[PDB]
Symmetry: C3
Subunit: 224 residues, 3 copies
């Protein structure tokens, strides 16, 4: 019944789906070591730390294609979409905002939909690197990877923002889950647009997002 | 008597005013921790440290708009304008160069005119970000800010040049004076070019530069 | 007998000469402090460290001219040319690969030809910066320098890749041999393309490469 896979490709990420990535990347960023003291005494700095968690995929991919990293900032509807979350995640009265989304079913859905945004971002840069470079197999793996887990690759430099400098914790030295997966994804869909992979996009686009959500949902059910 | 405000807009920064910024940014850079030993044993490195103090506004703004940061270097009349100061500030015979400009009235005027150069640099990137992005409210605040206090934002990476690595001294964590002001300025003039601010440019362009000079002049009169 | 200098300009670097730079930059990179443990437990990270040794000249020069640093990556015939060496240098069975090229005559020739690749890379960016900026004397010295010893200038950030953070070991603070030479070379050939230097390119292009090889050959004969 492939007729159900076609209805998935018709999902618009701008309203509902862009914020799940913004929230799961901001909730996670706060749960990091000492990130709470940062926001209480330096509001300016915890904010930019959140933006690298959300728009680092766009930020890093812009640095790689010689595109202005301020370009991600121009989308004021997208920037303002992420910063409103950052305020309530931290500065909500009685912290009712974080207490609600931390709830396990809610937190499960919030993180599950960030994995959805991860897929189009791979295909974003894969086709976007296609624009600058037609059939460059590498360049498409990179810019697809750079948008999938950008917040985890600038993480070493994102740590340096909140004040933490751990020069021993690189991403190539030990590949984390959200990154070693986007590497796998950026390679698969590069074989899709390159037609080296025997499955349609809309069927591959749908099967990759499912393995990615079934893990993080299993991850958070066995982490709590 | 607004007729006196119009005569101010007709000020050319290329002869007299470009060097005041170059000098106040190089004099300050030398007065930094251990910057003297750097120039005595590594002339190459104290120089590039001075250039980030002077052209960091241009350097950082180039990195943000995907413009080649070597572009600030092409202006050989401007680069050579700043490096001649760096030699005499450090390597002048009997150090008569620094002893003279350190004099309080002279140092007051030298720093007062760097604040003048700060204003057009804000309007520089505000209109320059307008070129790439028409009515982007954010992008204009950024590239105006990046030219106003560029030497203070690459400062964490500029420290790493002279050898000092202080990963706890970021600019978003504690906003310094020259930076929290340029942020205020980059926002005001972004409301000017965007016509959200009820005052003409040439009247706002003149009133912002005065509050900025009356402070640093009060700063240096109460610091000595 | 200048007729022998003309036959040198007709040397194609793509087959034989591109790999000598790739090997001497990868062999040297492994001989660095703790680089062996990196490759045994983190294959991903020792690789990218090797690429900055080989394509750092292209990588850094791309960052300076606002050119996409992924552009060096698109040349799959060149990227794959360097990565095959990185595998055998490290992961060859019985390490017969490294034991052979470490042999002094072989190591002498391998390093001698990397110095050849150093010359066209200078003239590469000198004429390539000419494209973006006609008679910019500085910009041509830079982009010629950035391709000659790129792996040594991103070295501080390349160290940060393998895990080592030594903020006191900058290149402007103490100019190494491969760098203070490429600075000398990037200046000479900038006077060549600018016609401020009384010698033809093909005669200067040949005399610079000889002084560079006679040193490193004398260096490695007196180092062992
Ligand atoms: Ca560009």
């Amino acid at each position: 019944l492939s007729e159900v896979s076609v209805q998935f490709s018709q999902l618009s990420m701008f309203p509902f789906f862009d914020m799940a990535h913004y929230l799961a990347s901001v909730m996670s960023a706060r749960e990091q070591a000492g990130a709470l003291d940062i926001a209480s005494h330096s509001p300016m700095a915890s904010w930019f730390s959140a933006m690298l968690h959300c728009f680092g995929g766009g930020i890093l991919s812009s640095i790689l294609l010689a595109e202005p990293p301020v370009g991600i900032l121009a989308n004021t509807t997208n920037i303002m979409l992420a910063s409103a979350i950052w305020y309530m995640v931290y500065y909500f009265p009685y912290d009712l905002f974080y207490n609600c989304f931390f709830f396990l079913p809610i937190r499960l859905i919030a993180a599950g939909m960030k994995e959805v945004t991860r897929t189009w971002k791979i295909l974003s840069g894969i086709t976007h690197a296609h624009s600058h470079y037609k059939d460059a197999w590498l360049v498409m793996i990179t810019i697809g990877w750079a948008r999938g887990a950008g917040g985890g690759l600038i993480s070493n430099f994102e740590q340096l923002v909140r004040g933490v400098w751990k020069p021993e914790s690189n991403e190539f030295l030990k590949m984390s889950y959200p990154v070693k997966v986007t590497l796998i994804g950026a390679v698969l869909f590069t074989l899709q647009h390159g037609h080296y992979l025997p499955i349609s996009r809309h069927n591959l686009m749908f099967i990759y997002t499912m393995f990615l959500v079934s893990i993080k949902v299993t991850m958070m059910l066995t982490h709590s």
